[PDB]
Amino acid sequence: MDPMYLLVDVGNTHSVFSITEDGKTFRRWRLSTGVFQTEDELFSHLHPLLGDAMREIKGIGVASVVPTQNTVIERFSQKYFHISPIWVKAKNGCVKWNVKNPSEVGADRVANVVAFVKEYGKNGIIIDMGTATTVDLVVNGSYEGGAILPGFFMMVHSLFRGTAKLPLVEVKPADFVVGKDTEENIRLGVVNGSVYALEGIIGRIKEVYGDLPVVLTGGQSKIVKDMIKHEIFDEDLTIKGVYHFCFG
Amino acid sequence: MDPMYLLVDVGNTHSVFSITEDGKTFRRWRLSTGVFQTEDELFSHLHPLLGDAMREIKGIGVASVVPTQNTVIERFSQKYFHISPIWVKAKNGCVKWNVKNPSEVGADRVANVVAFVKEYGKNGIIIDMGTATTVDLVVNGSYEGGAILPGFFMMVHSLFRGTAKLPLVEVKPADFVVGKDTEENIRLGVVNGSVYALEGIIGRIKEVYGDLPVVLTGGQSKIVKDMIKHEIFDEDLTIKGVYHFCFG
Numbered sequence: 001m002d003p004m005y006l007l008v009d010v011g012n013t014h015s016v017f018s019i020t021e022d023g024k025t026f027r028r029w030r031l032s033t034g035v036f037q038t039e040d041e042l043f044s045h046l047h048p049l050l051g052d053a054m055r056e057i058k059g060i061g062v063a064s065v066v067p068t069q070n071t072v073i074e075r076f077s078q079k080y081f082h083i084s085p086i087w088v089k090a091k092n093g094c095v096k097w098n099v100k101n102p103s104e105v106g107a108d109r110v111a112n113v114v115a116f117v118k119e120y121g122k123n124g125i126i127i128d129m130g131t132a133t134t135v136d137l138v139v140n141g142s143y144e145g146g147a148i149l150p151g152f153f154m155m156v157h158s159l160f161r162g163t164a165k166l167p168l169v170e171v172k173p174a175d176f177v178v179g180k181d182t183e184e185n186i187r188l189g190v191v192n193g194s195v196y197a198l199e200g201i202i203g204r205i206k207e208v209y210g211d212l213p214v215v216l217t218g219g220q221s222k223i224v225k226d227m228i229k230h231e232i233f234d235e236d237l238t239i240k241g242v243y244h245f246c247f248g
Numbered sequence: 249m250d251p252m253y254l255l256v257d258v259g260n261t262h263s264v265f266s267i268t269e270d271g272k273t274f275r276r277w278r279l280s281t282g283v284f285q286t287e288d289e290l291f292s293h294l295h296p297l298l299g300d301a302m303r304e305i306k307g308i309g310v311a312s313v314v315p316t317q318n319t320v321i322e323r324f325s326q327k328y329f330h331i332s333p334i335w336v337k338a339k340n341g342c343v344k345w346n347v348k349n350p351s352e353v354g355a356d357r358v359a360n361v362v363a364f365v366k367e368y369g370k371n372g373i374i375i376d377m378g379t380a381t382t383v384d385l386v387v388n389g390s391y392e393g394g395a396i397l398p399g400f401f402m403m404v405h406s407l408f409r410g411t412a413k414l415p416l417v418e419v420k421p422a423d424f425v426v427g428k429d430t431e432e433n434i435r436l437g438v439v440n441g442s443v444y445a446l447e448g449i450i451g452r453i454k455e456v457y458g459d460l461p462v463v464l465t466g467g468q469s470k471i472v473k474d475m476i477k478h479e480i481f482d483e484d485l486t487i488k489g490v491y492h493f494c495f496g
C-alpha cells in the first residue's frame with residue numbers, strides 16, 4: 001500500500017515533524033524543541049496540525065541531536081502509536097564512514113549524507129545552515145568528515161550576550177562593502193562573513209577532491225541562497241534522509 | 249622630561265593596563281574586566297604589577313567598551329591620583345569619522361584608527377581579534393566603517409552553550425581540509441573559517457578601495473597571524489591609540 005510515516009528531525013532549537021506516504025512528497029511542520037516537554041505536550045501540539053492524518057501513522061523515524069528529548073519522542077511513539085521509533089545513526093552499509101568515531105557524527109548529518117547518496121550521487125558537499133552550520137563531505141560514497149560553524153542566529157546572539165554595547169541584530173545580508181553603523185557592521189561580519197567562511201572551506205575541499213556538487217539545506221539557508229554557489233537546493237534533505245534510513 | 253602615562257583599554261573580557269614615558273615603548277599587563285570591581289580592587293591588583301612605577305603616573309588615558317566599568321576607572325583615577333581620566337571618543341581632528349553615528353563607534357576601534365594614522369599612514373585595514381573581531385577601514389585619513397564578527401573564543405563557546413552535543417573546543421588552527429572528529433570539525437569551521445571570512449571581507453574592500461596595507465592586532469591574533477596576509481603586526485595598537493589621543 002502507501003503507509004504513512006512520521007519523520008522527526010530534533011534540532012537544538014526546532015524540531016521538524018513531517019508526514020509522507022511515498023518518501024517523495026512531504027507535508028511539514030516545525031515546533032520549538034523546548035525544555036522538559038512531555039509526550040502529552042507533544043501530542044497536544046501536533047493534534048490540530050496533523051488532524052486526521054494522526055491516526056494513519058504506521059512508523060516513526062527520528063534523527064535527534066538533543067539526547068534529553070529522545071525519551072519524550074520514545075514515550076510519545078509508544079503511548080500514542082504503540083510502536084518504538086527508529087533512530088537514525090551512522091552504520092555500515094550504504095555509506096562508508098571514514099572518520100575517527102562515526103558514532104559521534106550528529107544524526108542530522110547522517111540523515112543528510114544518507115539522503116544525498118540515495119537521491120543525488122556518490123560525490124558531493126552538503127551545507128546545512130541550522131543552529132550550527134555544518135559542512136559534510138562525501139566522496140565515492142565515503143563520508144570524509146567536514147566542518148562545524150556557529151549558525152547565523154547563534155553568531156548575532158553571541159555578540160549581543162557577550163558584549164556590553166552590541167545590540168541583537170536581525171539576520172540579513174549586507175549589500176555594502178563596509179558597514180556604516182553597528183547593525184550594518186554585524187550583518188557584514190556575521191552573514192556575508194559566514195558565507196565567505198563556507199566558500200573558503202568548500203574551495204579548499206574542491207582543490208583536493210575536485211569540483212563536487214554542493215547541496216544547500218537548513219532552516220537558515222533560504223535567506224542567503226543567492227550568495228553561495230550551489231547545484232542543489234533541498235530544504236527537505238534531512239527529513240528525506242530520516243525516511244530513507246528508517247523506511248528505505 | 250618624560251612624564252609617565254597610564255593607558256587603559258577596557259575590553260569585554262580583558263582590561264589592558266600599560267605605562268609609557270615616551271609613547272614609543274610600553275610596559276603592559278592584562279587583567280580580567282570582572283563584574284562589580286571597585287577602585288580599591290583595581291589598585292590592589294595593580295599594586296604588585298606596577299610596583300614603584302605607580303607613584304610616577306602623571307596622566308591616565310582610557311578606551312572603554314564596557315560603560316559600567318567607567319565609574320570604577322574614574323574613581324580609581326581620582327582616589328589614587330587626584331586626576332580624572334581622559335576618555336577616548338570619536339572627534340574631529342586627525343581622523344574624519346565617515347559613518348552614520350561616530351559616537352557609537354567602539355572606543356577601542358577609535359584608538360586603533362588614531363594609532364594607525366599617527367604611526368603607519370592614511371590608508372589601511374585594521375583587524376583586531378578580541379572578544380569580537382573587528383575590521384576597520386581608513387582611506388585618506390577618513391574612517392569609512394567596517395565589520396564586526398564574533399571572536400574565536402566567542403564562537404567556540406557559542407557552539408558549546410548553544411547545542412546539546414558539542415564540547416568546548418580549544419582555539420587551534422586546522423591543518424587539514426576536512427575534520428575527522430568533532431573537535432577537528434569545530435577548529436576548521438571556527439578558526440580557519442573566521443580567517444576565510446576575514447580574507448573575504450578584506451578582498452571585497454580591496455576591490456573597491458585598492459590594495460591597502462593590513463594591520464593585525466588583538467589578544468587572539470597571535471594564534472592565527474601566520475594564516476592571514478598582513479603587512480603590520482602590532483599588538484600594542486590600541487594602547488598606542490589611547491596614548492596618541494590623550495597625550496599627543
Ligand SMILES: CC(C)(CO)[C@@H](O)C(=O)NCCC(=O)O
Binds near residue numbers: 065106413433
Ligand atoms: C553540529 C550539530 C549541532 C548540527 O545540528 C549536530 O550535528 C551535532 O550535535 N553533531 C555532533 C557532533 C558531530 O557531528 O561531529
Ligand SMILES: CC(C)(CO)[C@@H](O)C(=O)NCCC(=O)O
Binds near residue numbers: 260313396
Ligand atoms: C565591537 C566591539 C565590542 C569590539 O571590542 C566594540 O568596539 C564595541 O562595543 N563597539 C561598539 C559598536 C561599534 O563599534 O559600532
